[PDB]
Amino acid sequence: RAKAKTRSSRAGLQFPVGRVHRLLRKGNYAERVGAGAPVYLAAVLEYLTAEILELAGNAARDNKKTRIIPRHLQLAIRNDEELNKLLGKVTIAQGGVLPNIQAVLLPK
Amino acid sequence: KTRSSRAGLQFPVGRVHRLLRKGNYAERVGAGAPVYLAAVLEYLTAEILELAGNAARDNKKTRIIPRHLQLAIRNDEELNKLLGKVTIAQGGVLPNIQAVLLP
Amino acid sequence: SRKESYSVYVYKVLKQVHPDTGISSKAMGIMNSFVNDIFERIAGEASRLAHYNKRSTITSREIQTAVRLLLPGELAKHAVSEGTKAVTKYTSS
Amino acid sequence: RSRKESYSVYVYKVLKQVHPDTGISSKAMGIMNSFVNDIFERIAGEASRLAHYNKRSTITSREIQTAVRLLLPGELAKHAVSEGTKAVTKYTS
Amino acid sequence: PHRYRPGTVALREIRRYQKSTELLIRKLPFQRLVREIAQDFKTDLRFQSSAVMALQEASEAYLVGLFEDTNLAAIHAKRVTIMPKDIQLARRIRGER
Amino acid sequence: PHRYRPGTVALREIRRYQKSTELLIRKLPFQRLVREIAQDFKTDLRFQSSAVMALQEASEAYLVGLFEDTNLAAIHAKRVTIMPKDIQLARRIRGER
Amino acid sequence: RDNIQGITKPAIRRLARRGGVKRISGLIYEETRGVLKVFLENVIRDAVTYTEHAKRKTVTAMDVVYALKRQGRTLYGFG
Amino acid sequence: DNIQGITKPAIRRLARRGGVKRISGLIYEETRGVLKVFLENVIRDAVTYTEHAKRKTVTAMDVVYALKRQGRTLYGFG
DNA sequence: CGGATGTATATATCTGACACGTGCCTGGAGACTAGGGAGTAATCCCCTTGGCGGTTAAAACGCGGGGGACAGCGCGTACGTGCGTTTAAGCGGTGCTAGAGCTGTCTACGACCAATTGAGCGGCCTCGGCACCGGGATTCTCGA
DNA sequence: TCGAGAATCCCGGTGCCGAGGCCGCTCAATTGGTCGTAGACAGCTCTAGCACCGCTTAAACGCACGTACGCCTGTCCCCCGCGTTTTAACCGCCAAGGGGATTACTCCCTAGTCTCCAGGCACGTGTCAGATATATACATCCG
């Protein structure tokens, strides 16, 4: 009997292949769920999370603070033009509005 | 014998049940769900055809043209909210002229 | 190689509502698309709602709630009344 | 008391793998969990739609690879599909 | 001859093309545009005619809606002439870009 | 008696409410308003505290977006102040009404 | 009743400032009172229906996040 | 030149369906640009669907599904 | 309103999409079962409502005033349109080959269940990142 | 420009309570097989999207001429900023109850298999509703 080896480590992923596989099983998405589909979905999820977290961390470090809070995550989502298009409909609780001011409203 | 007739409907109940089974909406579908959904679909269809017939009578034509559908769906305050985003192919536009455009 | 349609089924309703009125094939296709669209709009909403409550059955109740959600007020009332009438005619028959 | 599920010890690993000296608050953790859940729902629903549309009954890696090219805008989709292919080809071996 | 006052010809045009159900755009130029834009992503894209017709309907409808919103914005500005800034306003509030 | 020029307090106090995250509406007035509105649909209804905070924090971002669109529409008209007609225009172009 | 006016004029002022509005009219307050009422009715309608289907009498945060998700104004951080 | 096939009178009548009185001369380039953007956005999704199908043709069903994703679903093609 | 035009209105003749038998097979409807999802029952306590009282920032009121929304003149300039013409778009055939679409294998792949156990969640301290603030150095600002 | 004044940032201090690490402790994720079957593949068909030539002609295009209106001058009024007066939000802490999560036990209702039968849609006929062209009053513009 081979020793237990988790499927996330088998593919070198930080999100679980098994849990995504179970969710696709019992989520009523298809009659049968493929084998590589869960690991592919886990890879996509972990890449997206890594990107949105890296941007938020950079923005927070710019703000001289170590903790990541919804403000610095709101800035990360609304700053990059690709995540803004991906999350156009989303509202973030306790997020605030990115600092902008119109040129016409400027003094004089 | 057709459940479509024991319930006194016009749309199928068998087709709706079969689609709900292979639509993979849930593992198990209820017994009154297909008849309820068929009744709702039939009521909406009857309303739409009534409006289209009224529009056809307005245009003095015995047949209903997609333009009649467009007029009927744009001329009502409640079915517009249900079909506001959609566009009828080969249809038309509601006759609309702004007030300032008038001389 | 067969394609499912709704031509006769809309036609019966038309004849019951407006006699001596015909439908061009384009309008029949439009109505078929409309029925197939509302069917999915209701079924998918009922599926998501049933799955949101740790339930695995789509009975008349989930669709009735879906009808109440997907329609405007004065139309939702009539649609729900029609659904209850049909189901109550069916539960007794 | 009956376990709820959350991607907490799962986003901690990614954050510590990208920023070894950064921490996340509970509210931002809740935002991240809801974002990952929403992306999963969107992508899985799109793959299911493709499977139903093409008259197939199983969502293989191809369906999720196609769905990503639609859901993810911009040059993000290119990196996402590249890393998905990398992960799946390493998993096959 | 008679020279129409500017505006009356415009409304004579409006009230006759409102009833129009037609497409207003020439089929071959739009089909060529669709083929050209398709060639960028992949080559040998054989377009079915019904697909081109559906795309034409959708594009016509979208442009009609955009011009309706643009008309609304232009009338707001105490103006009766369309300007590109009114189109930018419409495409910003609609959040399309 | 130093008096700020009209607009100085507008270019200020606009920084505070943009850089920080807050609610900008008192808890209890909004709670009772929500109770009042919900009383019509169903009598004797109980709201979880989180279910009121979520409603408020999702209705703040709607008003903020509507006001941003209204401001853009007012700028279009070569003005600074925003009129109600700007608000109906914003809703109409957004397609909500 | 009469809590719609509870959303006070300074509240609309602060919201406009956060949005980026420099000068404020007089009737915009009433119009903001109207649009807020309409939006909250349109959300509470769905929230109460979702609660009623479940056969409970407490509106949870999840059953409001669902209602906002239906309208396309999805909210993160709750449920 | 393929884009300039949609010429000034065509855009004028489209605007007339929009119900307008007077149209400026700078509208044409902006309209061509926005139609170009919308058409490429729809065609990318349609071609993606066709590539999923392992086919080399774009059927009307693919176009109506691509529009369905865009939130502008179209009745009258199946 | 004198005069003039593209505005509905009544008529003949297509004529081709719409309306109607049909049949047959193909999916729906009885017949019957059984096993697992759901309704009913109890309970209990976590969470919700209701309430009193001290505290004060926020709301309301009120007035000075100043900058902007607005009323108006004009002008020339960019946009209607009348018309020739000329340019390329639908019709309508021709040819035809590449690709969608429907069947027949049968095999590699996924559901399922029987052991097996470590990863992930519930719970418990705990110390330091950040909240709050005193106050000082620092930087806009507008009346001069 | 300039200088008193009004905000503002930040340096440093104290304080805290909530991420974070650690420790049980289940049960959902791993193996190991069978077992059926979805589709991967090949092949054959047939069909329509594509190419092209000419033809008729609808309208696209360029050249003008007229002119409607998009864009500084002055005005008054309404919204901002501050000073004073509330007053209801808020925070705390209490008390009480109710209904929302839990298990436990049916139990009955829909998935599943089978056999039968009628109805729904392609496959063929007619046929008549409405397009298409022709001649007659006219609402409104030129002026």
Numbering used by the authors:
A (entry chain C): 11 to 118
B (entry chain G): 15 to 117
C (entry chain H): 32 to 124
D (entry chain D): 31 to 123
E (entry chain A), F (entry chain E): 38 to 134
G (entry chain F): 23 to 101
H (entry chain B): 24 to 101
Task: Kindly provide excerpts from the paper associated with this entry.
The nucleosome consists of ~147 bp of DNA wrapped around a core octameric histone protein complex, containing two copies each of histone H2A, H2B, H3, and H41.
The third nucleosome contains an occluded AP site one bp adjacent to the nucleosome dyad at SHL0, referred to as AP-NCP0. The APE1 cleavage rate for AP-NCP0 was 1.30×10−4 ± 0.23×10−4 s−1, which is a 3,400,000-fold reduction compared to non-nucleosomal duplex DNA. In contrast, the damaged DNA strand containing the AP sites at SHL-6.5 and SHL0 make extensive interaction with the histone octamer. Similarly, the nucleosomal DNA surrounding the AP site at SHL0 is adjacent to the H3-H3′ interface at the nucleosome dyad. Subsequent modeling of APE1 bound at these occluded AP site positions revealed significant clashes between APE1 and the histone octamer that are incompatible with APE1 binding and DNA sculpting. Together, this indicates large-scale structural rearrangements in the nucleosomal DNA and/or histone octamer are needed for processing occluded AP sites, which explains the moderate and low APE1 cleavage rates for AP-NCP-6.5 and AP-NCP0.
